[PDB]
Amino acid sequence: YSNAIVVLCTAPDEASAQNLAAQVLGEKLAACVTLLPGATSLYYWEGKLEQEYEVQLLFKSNTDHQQALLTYIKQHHPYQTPELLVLPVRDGDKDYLSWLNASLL
Amino acid sequence: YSNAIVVLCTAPDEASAQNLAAQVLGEKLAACVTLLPGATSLYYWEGKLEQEYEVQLLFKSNTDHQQALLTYIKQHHPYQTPELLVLPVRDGDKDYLSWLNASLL
Amino acid sequence: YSNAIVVLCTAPDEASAQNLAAQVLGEKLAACVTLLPGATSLYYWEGKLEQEYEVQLLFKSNTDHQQALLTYIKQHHPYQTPELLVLPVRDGDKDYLSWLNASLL
Ligand code: NA
Ligand code: NA
Ligand code: NA
Ligand code: NA
Ligand code: NA
Ligand code: NA
Q1: In angstroms, what CA-CA distances link A78 with A12, A17, A54, A100, C59?
Q2: Is B34 close to A56, i.e. CB distance below 8 A?
Q3: Which of A37, A77, B18, C59 shows the greatest Cβ crowding within 10 Å of its Cβ?
Q4: Which chains touch B (3 or more CB pairs under 8 A)?
Q5: Which ranges constitute the DSSP H helices of A1-93?
Q6: What domains are defined for chain C?
Q7: Which residues pair with A92 in a beta bridge?
Q8: How far apart are CA C56 and CA A62, in angstroms?
Q9: H or E segment at C25?
């Protein structure tokens, strides 16, 4: 396995998604943050089935910066309990991983 | 590795995607279902290259509910052979994982 | 773990993403390619924070064709150093996995 990771997270709108991405990148806690706006999420919250528009984010980072990234997002997110799921990366293109690794703190 | 999983699946349109998600959620087989509408999928089917609009779904659940979820979607999907790929989750925010686990059957 | 994989990659626009997908599929190096257009990616490039539109791609393939797929994309991509991250697949629907494998043999 490579040391790269892809962290999934959602935001209520593009404005908040962009602000969070900019903060994370300025702190060098991710190499690239990709936003997928216009998503819809369904889930139960306090006993009711909700259906809300959200932005699905993908934070591309590495294991050496994993906890710092999670902690940062958790403390700079509009939601109290944001989605934060780390996907492992089994392999990647050498040159891309090189760039990803070099971009981080 | 945490016990969380993210299941990839596609649906032909938002209406079918929403119905499936609502059903899975009511059955408590996923904690959150995110729909990414307006995607385009290319693939060969019966020897012909097809290019079709689809909704990419992400079902956020755990390994304990993995088989029931897969079986449920398979039996309640518009396609005869739907995409069902389980991505493992290496780690996550504990508060989020706690809510995810608590929302399941 | 199954032998399936999901490879993340981004393209600058739909035209280029579609051409790449078609080429990869003709070469039988992926069973299905899903395009998520209208995404926004933020990243530092040459010291400056960029915010650009991209298409997020998901190549659904197997470990048996993983290196050939990565090499092929790298040689047929508009970017000099494109994003190429391989996500492992823990499990999936038997019929879907069978179709994916058969499509590439
Ligand atoms: Na803006
Ligand atoms: Na902004
Ligand atoms: Na869209
Ligand atoms: Na609906
Ligand atoms: Na095209
Ligand atoms: Na052959």
Answers
A1: 8, 9, 12, 27, 32
A2: yes
A3: C59
A4: A, C
A5: 14-26, 66-75
A6: 1-105 (3.30.70.120)
A7: C85
A8: 19
A9: helix C14-26
